[PDB]
Design an enzyme around this catalytic site. Structure first.
Site, short mmCIF file in Angstrom:
data_model
loop_
_atom_site.label_atom_id
_atom_site.label_comp_id
_atom_site.label_asym_id
_atom_site.label_seq_id
_atom_site.Cartn_x
_atom_site.Cartn_y
_atom_site.Cartn_z
N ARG A 37 0.84 -1.22 -0.10
CA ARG A 37 0.16 0.05 0.39
C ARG A 37 1.02 0.71 -0.29
NH1 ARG A 37 -3.88 4.06 0.29
NH2 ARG A 37 -4.95 3.66 2.89
N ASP A 70 -2.71 -0.14 9.22
CA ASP A 70 -1.50 0.94 8.78
C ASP A 70 -0.02 0.92 8.84
OD1 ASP A 70 -3.97 1.82 7.06
OD2 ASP A 70 -3.54 3.47 8.92
N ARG A 71 -0.10 0.81 10.05
CA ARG A 71 1.40 0.41 11.14
C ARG A 71 1.93 -0.51 12.13
NH1 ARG A 71 -1.93 4.79 12.26
NH2 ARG A 71 -1.94 3.78 14.04
N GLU A 195 -0.31 17.28 4.86
CA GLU A 195 -0.73 15.51 4.69
C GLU A 195 -0.41 15.65 4.17
OE1 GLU A 195 -3.53 13.70 6.87
OE2 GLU A 195 -3.01 13.75 8.70
N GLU A 196 0.46 14.51 3.55
CA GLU A 196 1.50 13.50 1.61
C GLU A 196 1.19 14.59 0.79
OE1 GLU A 196 -2.56 10.82 1.98
OE2 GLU A 196 -0.90 9.58 3.47
N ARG A 211 -2.86 17.30 1.56
CA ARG A 211 -3.98 16.84 1.60
C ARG A 211 -4.59 17.08 3.17
NH1 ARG A 211 -6.23 10.92 5.17
NH2 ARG A 211 -5.03 9.85 3.65
N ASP A 212 -6.07 18.02 2.55
CA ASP A 212 -6.08 18.43 4.27
C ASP A 212 -7.37 17.21 4.97
OD1 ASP A 212 -7.89 19.74 5.45
OD2 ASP A 212 -7.31 22.36 5.05
N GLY A 216 -10.83 20.92 4.59
CA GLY A 216 -10.51 21.23 3.51
C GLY A 216 -10.97 20.10 2.53
N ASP A 243 -9.74 16.24 -3.75
CA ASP A 243 -10.45 15.95 -2.42
C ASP A 243 -10.80 14.59 -2.40
OD1 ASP A 243 -9.01 15.00 0.55
OD2 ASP A 243 -8.55 16.43 0.64
N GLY A 264 -15.18 18.46 4.43
CA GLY A 264 -13.60 18.36 4.77
C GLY A 264 -12.55 16.96 5.22
N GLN A 266 -10.71 13.54 6.03
CA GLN A 266 -10.46 13.03 5.64
C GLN A 266 -10.36 13.60 4.37
OE1 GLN A 266 -14.14 10.71 7.09
NE2 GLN A 266 -12.85 9.24 9.05
N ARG A 290 -12.97 5.89 -2.69
CA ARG A 290 -11.98 5.92 -3.98
C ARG A 290 -12.15 5.24 -5.13
NH1 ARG A 290 -8.25 7.75 1.02
NH2 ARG A 290 -7.12 5.71 1.07
N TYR A 325 -4.71 6.02 -3.97
CA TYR A 325 -3.47 7.68 -3.84
C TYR A 325 -3.13 7.90 -5.46
CZ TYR A 325 -3.12 7.86 1.20
OH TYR A 325 -2.74 7.63 2.28
C1 LIG Z 1 0.76 7.26 8.85
C2 LIG Z 1 -0.67 6.53 8.35
O1 LIG Z 1 -0.54 5.94 9.87
N1 LIG Z 1 -1.12 6.94 7.56
C3 LIG Z 1 -2.34 6.75 7.06
C4 LIG Z 1 -3.05 7.83 6.57
C5 LIG Z 1 -3.44 8.38 7.81
O2 LIG Z 1 -3.90 7.69 8.76
C6 LIG Z 1 -4.75 9.62 8.03
O3 LIG Z 1 -3.62 10.89 6.68
C7 LIG Z 1 -4.48 10.94 9.25
O4 LIG Z 1 -3.79 11.07 9.53
O5 LIG Z 1 -4.50 6.93 6.41
C8 LIG Z 1 -4.44 6.37 4.96
P1 LIG Z 1 -6.44 6.20 4.35
O6 LIG Z 1 -6.75 5.32 6.01
O7 LIG Z 1 -6.61 7.37 4.25
O8 LIG Z 1 -6.48 5.25 3.81
C9 LIG Z 1 -3.08 5.10 5.52
C10 LIG Z 1 -1.76 5.55 6.29
O9 LIG Z 1 -1.23 4.90 6.54
CA LIG Z 2 -10.28 16.78 2.76
#
Ligand SMILES: CC(=O)N[C@H]1[C@H]([C@H](O)[C@H](O)CO)O[C@H](P(=O)(O)O)C[C@@H]1O
Ligand SMILES: [Ca+2]
Ligand SMILES: *[C@@H]1O[C@H](CO)[C@@H](O[C@@H]2O[C@H](CO)[C@@H](O[C@@H]3O[C@H](CO[C@H]4O[C@H](CO)[C@@H](O)[C@H](O)[C@@H]4O)[C@@H](O)[C@H](O[C@H]4O[C@H](CO)[C@@H](O)[C@H](O)[C@@H]4O)[C@@H]3O)[C@H](O)[C@H]2NC(C)=O)[C@H](O)[C@H]1NC(C)=O
Ligand SMILES: *[C@@H]1O[C@H](CO)[C@@H](O)[C@H](O)[C@H]1NC(C)=O
Ligand SMILES: *[C@@H]1O[C@H](CO)[C@@H](O)[C@H](O)[C@H]1NC(C)=O
Ligand SMILES: *[C@@H]1O[C@H](CO)[C@@H](O)[C@H](O)[C@H]1NC(C)=O
Length: 388
Positions: A37, A70-71, A195-196, A211-212, A216, A243, A264, A266, A290, A325
């Site tokens: 991912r 994710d982590r 972000e991102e 990304r806001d 937003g 977005d 706004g 997510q 998505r 993404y």
């Molecule tokens: C470091 C981290 O965990 N990044 C995660 C971000 C993060 O949760 C959001 O940006 C909120 O800050 O989400 C994406 P998603 O859930 O949009 O699919 C999965 C990513 O791994």
């Molecule tokens: Ca947003």
């Protein structure tokens, strides 16, 4: 070899042409392919590579179960030449649940982030060796771009943020020379949540479209002056908006200055790039999910508030298919520097419940000043043939 300075005009583009696709999910049903991912692509002066954050497991593996998370400490950054899928011979460049890489013309720079959410650490790996590191400054998930960083004259920039996902956060821009953090500038300007970021060189600066995740549905912009390290930020002027989730081309707005407050919360990593007063952008076709992916030019999308005059649209993934993404990457041509993009095609858990894993494949396009046709290039896997 000398350092990249990206001082060539941006190529004039007509739209984008098909470039690469890896078909990893389709291949996962009959081969040992990694579960991944957050992919991206980046090129050194000679060739391009595809990156992605693995999940420390192949797909046809019991360990792929519940890979929606994710982590985990087993996530590593994978790197292969563009076009070769993530098979067992792939190199795990570093430990990372969030990353960014770019080449300065002499060697690769990878910024890899792992650890506890409240106390993550980012390692800066340059030319194969660990050169520096930094720890969380807000104790709340240190994270970065998930796409390429950019270097001019030997100095590379990467934007990072630590703090709330839907609230005020602390965003900073680090400047690194040969893996060493030589300066850190805090965010400035009017962006409310960043972000991102998807960054690209705009000699003598670097521009990012991010990304806001808070207030937003329009995308923040981040201007970085390589000369004095001064930052500036705003939102893209376009009333079209990139977005997801977002409003509706009919009821969506952007004033170039503040989060629009239209759905706004997510979002999704995405991109855009200026061309004079216009803007080339891409986004999911669906305003809620998505799904699908399209690109077009917005006449005046860069300079005029709420402009909605669209032209040169292209469907990359039809609306009945999943996307995810997307980010940008720049490539140096003989006389100008071109802009390309990749799109993550997520499959599995979350939307698709037949299986228990979550993974993705990619498709990539590059701008062209020539001619092109029509099509749709989705993942291609039949969820019914898939393991699990
Ligand atoms: C470091 C981290 O965990 N990044 C995660 C971000 C993060 O949760 C959001 O940006 C909120 O800050 O989400 C994406 P998603 O859930 O949009 O699919 C999965 C990513 O791994
Ligand atoms: Ca947003
Ligand atoms: C986020 O991440 C950072 C970096 O990893 C963590 O910081 C480290 O925390 C540990 C644990 O506290 C530190 O290591 C310990 O150092 C102690 C000495 O420091 C204190 O006492 C001296 C006395 O002269 C003071 O000068 C100094 O200012 C401190 O007040 C040792 O005594 C520790 O050993 C003892 O405790 C451990 C468990 O903690 C036992 O297992 C041992 O057996 C022993 O009894 C230990 O070596 C370390 O120095 C910190 N690093 C830095 C760079 O500061 C953060 O804690 C972390 N935060 C969170 C919330 O997770
Ligand atoms: C950029 O690098 C090229 C190739 O090294 C060089 O000829 C050019 O003069 C440089 N320009 C700037 C503005 O740094
Ligand atoms: C890049 O390097 C060249 C040569 O030192 C210099 O003239 C140019 O202005 C530099 N640009 C930036 C953005 O630092
Ligand atoms: C995945 O995990 C859940 C429990 O965590 C279990 O019920 C499920 O059967 C697992 N999937 C497979 C294919 O075993």
């Amino acid at each position: 070899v000398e350092y990249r300075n990206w001082s060539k005009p941006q190529c004039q583009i007509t739209g984008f042409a098909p470039f690469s696709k890896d078909n990893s999910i389709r291949l996962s049903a009959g081969g040992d392919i990694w579960v991944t991912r957050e992919p991206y692509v980046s090129c050194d002066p000679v060739k391009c590579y595809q990156f992605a954050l693995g999940q420390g497991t192949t797909l046809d593996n019991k360990h792929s179960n519940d890979t929606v998370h994710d982590r985990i400490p087993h996530r590593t950054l994978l790197m292969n030449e563009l076009g070769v899928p993530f098979h067992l011979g792939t190199r795990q460049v570093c430990i990372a649940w969030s990353s960014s890489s770019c080449h300065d013309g002499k060697a690769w720079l990878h910024v890899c982030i792992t650890g506890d959410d409240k106390n993550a650490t980012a390692s800066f790996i340059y030319d194969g060796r660990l050169v520096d590191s930094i720890g969380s400054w807000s104790q709340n998930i240190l994270r970065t771009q998930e796409s390429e960083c950019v270097c001019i004259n030997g100095t590379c920039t990467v934007v990072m943020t630590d703090g709330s996902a839907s609230g005020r956060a602390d965003t900073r821009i680090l400047f690194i020379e040969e893996g060493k953090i030589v300066h850190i500038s805090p965010l400035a300007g009017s962006a409310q949540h960043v972000e991102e970021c998807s960054c690209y060189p705009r000699y003598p600066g670097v521009r990012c479209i991010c990304r806001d995740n808070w207030k937003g549905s329009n995308r923040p912009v981040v201007d970085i002056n390589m000369e004095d390290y001064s930052i500036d930020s705003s939102y893209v002027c376009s009333g079209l908006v990139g977005d997801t989730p977002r409003n509706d081309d009919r009821s969506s707005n952007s004033n170039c200055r503040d989060p629009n407050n239209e759905r706004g919360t997510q979002g999704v990593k995405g991109w855009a790039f200026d061309n004079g007063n216009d803007l080339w952008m891409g986004r999911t076709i669906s305003k809620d999910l998505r799904s699908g992916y399209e690109t077009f030019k917005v006449i005046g999308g860069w300079s005029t508030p709420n402009s909605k005059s669209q032209i040169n649209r292209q469907v990359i993934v039809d609306s009945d298919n999943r996307s995810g993404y997307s980010g940008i990457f720049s490539v140096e041509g003989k006389s100008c520097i071109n802009r390309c993009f990749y799109v993550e095609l997520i499959r599995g858990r979350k939307q698709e419940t037949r299986v228990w894993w979550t993974s993705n494949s990619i498709v990539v396009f590059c701008g062209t000043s020539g001619t092109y046709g029509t099509g749709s290039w989705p993942d291609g896997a039949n969820i019914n043939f898939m393991p699990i």
